[PDB]
Design an enzyme around this catalytic site. Structure first.
Site, PDB file in Angstrom:
ATOM      1  N   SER A   1     -46.591  13.055  65.739  1.00 57.50           N
ATOM      2  CA  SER A   1     -47.215  13.435  67.078  1.00 57.50           C
ATOM      3  C   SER A   1     -48.706  13.390  67.567  1.00 57.50           C
ATOM      4  O   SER A   1     -48.810  12.861  68.445  1.00 57.50           O
ATOM      5  CB  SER A   1     -46.757  15.068  67.323  1.00 57.50           C
ATOM      6  OG  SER A   1     -45.171  15.177  67.226  1.00 57.50           O
ATOM      7  N   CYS A  52     -36.048  28.115  73.537  1.00 55.19           N
ATOM      8  CA  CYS A  52     -36.842  28.841  74.577  1.00 55.19           C
ATOM      9  C   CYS A  52     -37.282  28.105  75.947  1.00 55.19           C
ATOM     10  O   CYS A  52     -37.658  27.036  75.960  1.00 55.19           O
ATOM     11  CB  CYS A  52     -38.172  29.111  73.903  1.00 55.19           C
ATOM     12  SG  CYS A  52     -39.454  30.140  75.044  1.00 55.19           S
ATOM     13  N   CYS A  62     -41.083  32.634  73.797  1.00 54.14           N
ATOM     14  CA  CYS A  62     -41.445  33.555  74.493  1.00 54.14           C
ATOM     15  C   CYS A  62     -40.852  34.945  74.066  1.00 54.14           C
ATOM     16  O   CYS A  62     -41.695  36.121  74.319  1.00 54.14           O
ATOM     17  CB  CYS A  62     -41.138  33.359  76.003  1.00 54.14           C
ATOM     18  SG  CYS A  62     -39.396  33.715  76.326  1.00 54.14           S
ATOM     19  N   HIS A  68     -49.035   9.693  68.065  1.00 58.63           N
ATOM     20  CA  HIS A  68     -48.785   9.172  69.352  1.00 58.63           C
ATOM     21  C   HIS A  68     -49.212   9.888  70.624  1.00 58.63           C
ATOM     22  O   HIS A  68     -49.064   9.353  71.501  1.00 58.63           O
ATOM     23  CB  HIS A  68     -47.324   9.417  69.517  1.00 58.63           C
ATOM     24  CG  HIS A  68     -46.267   8.791  68.511  1.00 58.63           C
ATOM     25  ND1 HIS A  68     -46.791   7.328  67.966  1.00 58.63           N
ATOM     26  CD2 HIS A  68     -45.456   9.248  67.439  1.00 58.63           C
ATOM     27  CE1 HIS A  68     -45.815   7.098  66.862  1.00 58.63           C
ATOM     28  NE2 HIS A  68     -44.897   8.386  66.764  1.00 58.63           N
ATOM     29  N   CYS A  75     -36.529  35.305  77.019  1.00 61.21           N
ATOM     30  CA  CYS A  75     -35.247  34.456  77.816  1.00 61.21           C
ATOM     31  C   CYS A  75     -34.195  34.609  77.260  1.00 61.21           C
ATOM     32  O   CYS A  75     -33.851  35.104  76.041  1.00 61.21           O
ATOM     33  CB  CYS A  75     -35.769  32.883  77.887  1.00 61.21           C
ATOM     34  SG  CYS A  75     -35.852  32.054  76.284  1.00 61.21           S
TER      35      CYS A  75
END
Ligand code: CL
Ligand code: CL
Ligand code: CL
Ligand code: CL
Lengths: 396, 396, 396, 395
Positions: free
Chosen positions: D69, D146, D132, D72, D135
Site C-alpha cells: 500500500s 465499519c 468507530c 502504491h 455503527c
C-alpha cells in the site's frame, strides 16, 4: 400384470466422447447427453420386484412427481441426444419424487422411526441419492458426495410404477403426516419431500440457514425456489422476496408465504430488493434460475449497495456458463458463496417431513395429478408447457 | 417539574460483605443483596435530563415494563436486604424495558438505521447493558461480558420517567413497527424488545438456534420463557413445549404458538415431553425457572431417554444452588450446556424488532398498562400477586 | 491352531438388575458391572476367522494396546463383579487398540484410500465402535451414537489374537506412515490411533477445537489426556498445561509438547493455571480424570477468575458421581460444557493418521511391549502398577 | 524538533471522478487513484503530538514496516495518478505496520492487558483500521466493515515517525514477547503483527481454519501469503503447500514451515498439488496473488480432481479482473468461497501476539531494516526491486 414408465435409448456416443472411468459400455454413463440418443418413454410390463437382500423393502407407489430431470432425459437436442447431462443407465424405470406404502420388508429392513423391522402398511417416501455408506465422504457424514453413488430413476428402477424396491436405509416414515393430510393428500405431500429436501439442503445445510428476522432473496420460482420460500418463511425470515418471470409461479410463491415477488423482466430487481429491505439487503440469496451468469451482476449489486453484511449466495441450479465473479464485492461486504447438491444426510428428510406435519403445505404447488398412463404425455408436454409447475402421478 | 420512579436504600452491609474491587463505598456495589437494606420506591421530582456528551440522546418515554429485577430490588428478605444480587447504585431511577420518541440529540448521536444523526420524533428502544466498547470482550464482539459495564435502571437512571438520557449507541429504531402497530401499541411492542432480546440471545445466539423441524422445550413461562416460545415457533420448531405451573402463563404460551403446555405440578414432565415428541425429545431446552437444581433431573432424564441427540440446554435464569450434573448423560446423548446472559451485541435488538414487524406480537403478554403514579404500587403488588405476567407503564 | 486372549465370566446379576431392553439373558448386557462376575482372562484356542459377508476383511494383528477398560473388565469389586460398567458380551476376545496387515478381503471390502478392494499386505488400523450405518444418528452423520452399536473387544471378538475379522468400513489405511515409522514402530503407531482419536473427537470435534494462540488445560495424564496434549500443541495452542499427580505421566506430557505441568497434590492448581496463562485462563479444559466431582470446583474457579471468555469444558472420562455445577459461572464467563464419547465419524481416524505421518509421534507413551501370552498377566498387573502408562501386545 | 515521512499529492481528479458522498473536496477521497496526482514522499518536520482526547496515547515508534500500500500510494500510472485505489487523505504521515513504547497516555486511555490506564514504557502495536465502535457492523462484532472508518497512515498520521498518537482502544500490549524476543527484535516482531493479522483473519476467521491433519494451499508468497504459511503450519496442517514464482519467497516459505513449494512458471501447479496431497487435495486455498483470474482455473481443477471435499477458497488479495467461476465445481465438490479484508476484531491481534510469543517467528521475512531517512528511497525502490520481501524502519 405389472407396469411402469420406462425410458429406452440408443447408446450412440458423440465423437468427442471417451468412455469415463466409472462408465459401462452400452449400459451406464456419467455424461448422459454425450451418449444416449433417441430416448423413448413408454408404459411397459415389468417383472415383480423381489427381496434380493435382507435390508430391502417393496413399496406400493401412491404418488410420484415429474422432475425437470425427467423432462430433460426424454427431450433431445437437434441431433437426438438427451438434454440431461449426468448419470444415466438405460433402460430404466423413471420417477424419483415419490411416496407409498410398504408391502414387504426383508428381515433386516429397519424403519428408523421405530428402529424395528419395517411393518406392512407403513407410509414412506425415499431418497433418490443412493449413497453407499462406506466411502470417505459417507464416513465423514457427507452422503451427497458419495464416491460410489447410484440414482433412483436414473440408473436404478424408480417409481413411475405400481411397485418400487429400495434399500430400507433410504426410506423415511410419513407416519407424522397421518391426521394432518387426509387420504391421498398424505401421499402427495410425501412425494414433495425429495425436491423440498433439495431446497432444504441448499438453504439450511449448505446456506447455513438464517436467524429469525433476517431477509432472504430467492431467484427462480420452480419447485426448488418455491420450497425455499416456504422453508425460509418457516425459519423466521422477516422478508422473503422471490424474483421470477412466470406469473403462476409468483402467485404460488405468495401462497407459500413470500412477502414480495418481483418480475425481473418488468421491474428493476436491484432497486426493488433494496426498496423492499429498506437498504438492508438480505442474509441469503438462493440462485435457483440456472442462468447465474445473467443474474449474478444483479445479485452482486444488491450485496454491494446493501447495508447488511455476511450475505451468503447459495448456488443450487445447474448451469454450464461461467459466473462473472467480482472478488471485491465479497471482500468488502463480508459475503460468501456456497454450492449445493442433493437432499441426503444431515437429518434433512425427517426434518422436512416434521415441518410438513407441523403445517408447511407444499401440495399447493401441484398443478395437476394424472394416472400412470398419462405420464409419458405430460413428460413430453412439459417441454413447452410453462403453465405446469408440478405434475404428479397418483395411483388411485 | 419532572417526576420519576426512584428507589432509595440504606448502605448497611451484611457481615460477610467486603468492599468489591469495583465497588464505591456508600454508592455502588456488584453484590446488591449483601449491601442495600430497607429499600423505598416512590414517584419523586427529578432534574431535567440533559445532553452532556455529543453522542447522547433524550427520549420522551412512552412505555416501560416492570422486570422481575425491579420487583427484586424493591423486595427484601426477612432482614430487610434487597433480593436482587447484582450491580446496584442507589439512589437510581428504575426502568429499563422501554420505548419512546427522541426529543433531543447531540451532533454525534447517530441512528444506526440511517447512519445519520437521530431525528426528533424517531421512535426508539434502548439496550439496558451499557457496554464500554473498548475492553477485550467488547473488542472481540462479546459486549454482554463487558469488563467496564454499567446498567440502565440499576446504577444509571432509567425509564420509569417522563424523559431518559442514553448514549445513541444503545438506541435502536422502531420505524419498522409503524403502520403495523398503531398508536400506543407501537410503544408497547418497543418496551418488550429488551426481555424478548434476552430470550433471543439465550435461544439463538448462545443456544445456537434450531433447524426448522426441530423440537424445543421451555421450562419457565415468565416473560423470557414466553418470548422463547414465540421466537422458536417463528424459527420453525415443529413442536414447542412449555412447562410452567401457572395456568395464565400456559394459556399465553398457547397464544404465542406453543403446541403443548405442561403443568409439572399435576403432570409428569418427563413422560409428557417424551410422549409429545414421539420419543425424539428436543434439540433445545431453555432453563428459565431459576430452580435448576429442581428441574435438572427431569431435563437429564428426557435427554437420556430421548432418541434425538445433540440437545443443548441453555441456562438463562439466575439461580444460586448447585446443579446436580450427570456427565454421562451429556457424553452418551452428545449433548451440551450453555450459559446465557444479557441482550446486547450480535444484532439481536434489530432482528427482534424486524421479527416483531413481520408478525411476532409479544404485546399479548402485557397483563396491564398503568400510569407512572401507579408504578410503586405494582412493584410492591408483584411480590405476591402471581396472576400478573407483565405490567407496563404507559404515558398517554 | 489359532490362539487369542479371551475373557470368561459368570452371568450372576446384582439384585437391583433388571434385563435391559437390548440385553440377552446369559450373553449380553449394557450394564457390565451389574451382571458379570468372577471374570477370568485366558489364552485359548479359537476357530479360524471367516469372511461371511462380502464387505469383511481378516487382519493379521501386529500390535494391540491394553486399554484401561480391559483392566476394568477383568478387575472386580469385593463381591466379584467386574468394574467395567458398560456394554459387554462374554465370552469375548479382548483388544480394540490395534493395527496389522490385511491377509484376506471379500469382493466388496473397499479400502477408502483407493476406493478399491483392500489389497493383501495393506497396513491398517480399525475403529472399535461398530456403527450400523443405517439408524437415524448414523444417517445424520453421528456414528458414535449409533442405535444398533456393537463393540470390538467388548461383545465382538477383538484383536488380542493372531487374526481379527472386521468389516472393511471400520478399517483405515496406515500407508502414510511408511518410511516415517520403520518396521514394527509403524504398527505401534497404528495401535495408538483409536485412543488418540478419542482425544481428538473430544477436543477438536466435540470441544470445537481452538484458534491458534489459545491456551488449553488438560486434567489427567492417562493416554487420552496425553493424546490431547499432543493434538492441541499441534493445533497451535500457545500454552498447553497438564495437571496429573503421576510423575511419569507429567514427564511424558512435557515430551509431547506441554508447556507446563502441574502436580495438583503438591501445587495449587488454580493459582498455577492463572499464573501460567497471565490471568487469561484457557479456551478449552479437558476433563480426563474420571473424578470430575473433585476437580470441578477448581475448573470453575479458573473460569470465574480468568479474563478470557468462551471457555469450553469437554468431559471425556467416565465418572459415576454428580458434578457440582455452578450455573452462574457459565453464564457470567460465557462458558460451555460438552460431553464426548467415541472416536468414529467426522474423518477423525484419517486425520489422526495424517497427523502422525507428519510428525506427531504417540509411540513415546508405550511403556512396554509384550507377547500375546503375557497379556493376561499384564491386564492383572495393571490393576496396581501405576508406572506402566501403556502396555502393548506386539506379534513378531 | 520532530520529523516524519509524509506524502503530499495534488488534488486533481480524473474527469470521470464525481465527489463521493463522504469525500471532502481537496482533502479526502474514497477513490485515491481517481483524484490524487504527482505524489511526493519526503522526511519533513512535524509538530509534537498532543493528547486531545482522554482515551489517546502517544507512542514512541521503534519499528514500522513498509506495506505494498505505501508503495502504491507513492507509485503513479503514466498520467501521474497514484496506484492506490482506496481511502486517502493527504498530506499524511505514512506507515501503519508498527510497534513502539507508550510515552504518554490520557486519563481514560485503557490498556486491555490490565483494564487500567496505560503506563509509560508499555511496548505496544496498534490496529490500522480505526473502527468507530458504534455503527451496526461494529455493534454486531464485525469492525473490518465499519461504516465510519478512518485509516492510520492513509488519512490519519501514521508511524513512519519518531512518535505517533492513537486511541488506546486500537493498541495491544507486547508484554508477552519480553524474554522471547531480545532487544529490537521485540519491536520487529510487533511491527509484523498487522500484516500477520490480515493473514490470520483471512485463514482462521473468514476461512474457518482447519482441523489438525488437513492440507492447505497458499497462492502468493508476499507477506500475507507467508504469514498464512506459518499460521496454518502452527494450526496443524499436515501439508502446507505454497505456490510462488519468486525464489526468495519460496525459500522463506520453507523457513516458515511449508512442506512443499511450487514455482508455477516452471512446474504444473495442478499436478504438483495433487501429487503432494496424494490425490486428496486441500481443506483451504488462500488466493493471495492478486491475479485470481489467472490462478482460478487451476484452483478449480485441484478442487474438481481432489477426493477431499468441503474446500474453502479465501480471497484476500485485491484485484480488479473478473473471476471465471464455475459453479458446478463448488456444487459437486461441496466447496465454498469467502472474501476477506482487514485485521480488526475477533481477538485476532491478541492471538497473533500470543502465537508469536509461543514460537511463531515472523521476523524472518524482514529482508532489511533501514533508518527513517531512507524510507522514501525504499518506498521508490520497491516499485522495481522484487527481491525485497519486507523492509522495516528501525528507529
Ligand atoms: Cl453432504
Ligand atoms: Cl456476548
Ligand atoms: Cl458422533
Ligand atoms: Cl469483521
Amino acid at each position: 400384470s405389472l407396469r411402469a414408465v420406462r425410458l429406452h435409448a440408443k447408446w450412440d456416443p458423440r465423437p468427442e466422447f471417451k468412455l469415463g472411468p466409472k462408465d459401462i459400455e452400452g449400459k451406464l454413463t456419467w455424461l448422459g447427453s454425450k451418449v444416449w440418443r433417441y430416448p423413448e418413454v413408454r408404459v411397459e410390463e415389468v417383472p415383480e420386484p423381489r427381496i434380493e437382500k435382507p435390508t430391502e423393502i417393496i413399496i406400493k407407489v401412491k404418488a410420484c412427481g415429474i422432475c425437470g430431470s425427467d423432462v430433460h432425459m426424454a427431450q433431445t437436442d437437434e441431433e437426438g441426444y438427451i438434454l440431461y447431462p449426468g448419470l444415466t443407465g438405460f433402460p430404466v424405470t423413471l420417477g424419483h419424487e415419490f411416496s407409498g406404502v410398504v408391502v414387504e420388508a426383508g428381515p433386516e429392513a429397519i424403519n428408523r422411526r421405530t428402529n424395528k423391522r419395517f411393518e406392512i402398511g407403513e407410509p414412506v417416501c425415499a431418497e433418490e441419492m443412493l449413497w453407499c455408506g462406506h466411502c470417505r465422504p459417507c464416513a465423514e457424514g457427507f452422503p451427497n458426495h458419495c464416491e460410489n453413488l447410484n440414482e433412483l430413476g436414473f440408473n436404478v428402477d424408480g417409481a413411475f410404477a405400481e411397485y418400487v424396491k429400495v434399500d430400507a436405509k433410504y426410506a423415511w416414515s410419513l407416519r407424522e403426516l397421518e391426521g394432518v393430510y387426509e387420504g391421498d393428500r398424505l401421499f402427495l405431500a410425501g412425494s414433495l419431500v425429495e425436491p423440498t429436501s433439495v431446497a432444504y439442503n441448499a438453504v439450511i445445510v449448505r446456506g447455513g440457514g438464517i436467524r429469525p428476522g433476517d431477509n432472504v432473496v430467492i431467484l427462480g420460482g420452480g419447485p426448488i425456489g418455491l420450497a425455499a420460500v416456504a422453508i425460509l418463511k418457516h425459519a423466521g425470515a422477516s422478508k422473503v422476496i422471490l424474483s421470477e418471470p412466470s406469473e403462476v409461479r409468483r402467485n404460488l410463491a405468495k401462497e407459500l408465504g413470500a412477502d414480495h415477488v418481483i418480475d425481473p423482466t418488468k421491474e428493476n430487481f436491484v432497486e426493488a430488493v433494496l426498496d423492499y429491505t429498506n437498504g438492508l439487503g438480505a442474509k441469503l440469496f438462493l440462485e435457483a434460475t440456472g442462468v447465474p451468469q445473467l443474474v449474478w451482476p444483479q445479485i452482486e449489486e444488491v450485496i454491494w449497495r446493501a447495508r447488511g453484511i455476511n450475505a451468503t449466495v447459495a448456488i443450487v441450479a445447474r448451469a454450464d456458463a461461467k459466473i462473472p465473479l467480482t472478488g471485491e464485492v465479497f471482500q468488502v461486504r463480508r459475503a460468501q458463496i456456497v454450492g449445493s447438491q442433493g437432499h441426503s444426510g444431515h437429518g434433512t428428510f425427517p426434518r422436512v417431513i416434521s415441518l410438513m406435519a407441523s403445517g408447511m403445505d407444499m401440495t399447493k404447488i401441484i398443478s395437476k395429478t394424472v394416472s400412470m398412463e398419462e405420464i409419458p404425455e405430460y413428460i413430453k408436454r412439459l417441454q413447452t408447457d410453462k403453465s405446469l409447475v408440478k405434475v404428479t402421478m397418483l395411483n388411485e
